[PDB]
């Protein structure tokens, strides 16, 4: 499952953003640097696929490797985040458009501080609820 990580990064601006690496439609893996996280309440890692829902294991090298974000949906709130090739946190969704459940809360996931370095000072909270019929256990980071 790890070979489905789009690893396309181009630090042409000499910022060194890649250090911490070590409307949701279809995003091209050729423009993604690192894992893609979607938040069906709980965070879900999205792997590379083709135009069909078939996973690919080429580290996002093929120009036909994409992430089917719209297919990964429960009528519940939805959103995804990822780092694009030049180091800009990209989002999509409607509740916020990323891991932002509350305007001041955020879904904690293993790459929260790399996509959102300013959320390090937030407090974790254990959340458990039934959304759309499934129980969701995750942590929320709020001010």
């Amino acid at each position, epitope marked *: 499952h790890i070979n489905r*990580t789009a690893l396309n990064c181009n*630090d*042409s601006l000499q910022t060194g953003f890649i250090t911490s690496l*070590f409307p949701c439609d279809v995003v091209s893996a050729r423009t993604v640097c690192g894992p893609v996280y979607c938040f069906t309440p709980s965070p879900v890692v999205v792997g590379t696929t083709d135009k069909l829902g078939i996973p690919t294991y080429n580290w996002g090298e093929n120009e036909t490797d994409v992430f089917m974000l719209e297919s990964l949906r429960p009528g519940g709130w939805f959103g995804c985040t990822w780092m694009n090739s030049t180091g800009f946190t990209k989002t999509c969704g409607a509740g916020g458009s990323g891991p932002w459940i509350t305007p001041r809360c955020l879904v904690d996931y293993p790459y929260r501080l790399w996509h959102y370095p300013c959320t390090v000072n937030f407090t974790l909270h254990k959340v458990r609820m039934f959304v759309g019929g499934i129980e969701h256990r995750f942590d929320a980071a709020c001010n």
Partner: antibody
Amino acid sequence: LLEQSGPEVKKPGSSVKVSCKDSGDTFNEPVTWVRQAPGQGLEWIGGIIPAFGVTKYAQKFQGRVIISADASTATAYLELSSLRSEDTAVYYCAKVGLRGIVMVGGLAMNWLDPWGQGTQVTVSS
Amino acid sequence: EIELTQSPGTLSLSPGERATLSCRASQSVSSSYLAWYQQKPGQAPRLLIYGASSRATGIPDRFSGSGSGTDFTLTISRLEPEDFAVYYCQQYGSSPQTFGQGTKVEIKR
């Protein structure tokens, strides 16, 4: 700098396993293997990004080499099989710089620093 | 594979003189992905220039590189005794990264 294994001497047709350990916490960052024969310059062999395990190889050693990394130790490995007398060289281990890095499908390329002290691999019968 | 040719094979200069080393590529490489390295006998190569122009942290000012396209040059304006060694040019913009053959700077007496 980076610590590599000592000198090795193996018969033709055998296989070597050269280690490369670093003291810093930059182990997960991309590493690159390069060898240098006596009369020639530096020759790229392959690389690995230990954070994800991506291995990219040069076309020459596509079926003869396998590069691995162990996260428990601080060591990335280069394993060259079916040795020949041409493979007698000094094998080097260096980190790919992060600032200004270019990564295409898991192959990270940039200037190389820091380096390991090198590993002499002698292939003789 | 991009072929990197260095010239001359050996440069014999006295301490204080100017050394200019050349690196010529077969393809037109991008000036942002050329590096120069210094290597002394027994030791590992040390990086001097990256991006064909920028000096590495800890490299004296007398080292300097320039060039674009196929022809690149490294200049040591005032040779010091510890500058005498072999030098290598590397390109890291094409899928198989390549190095040139060594240019050895040697003390003239």
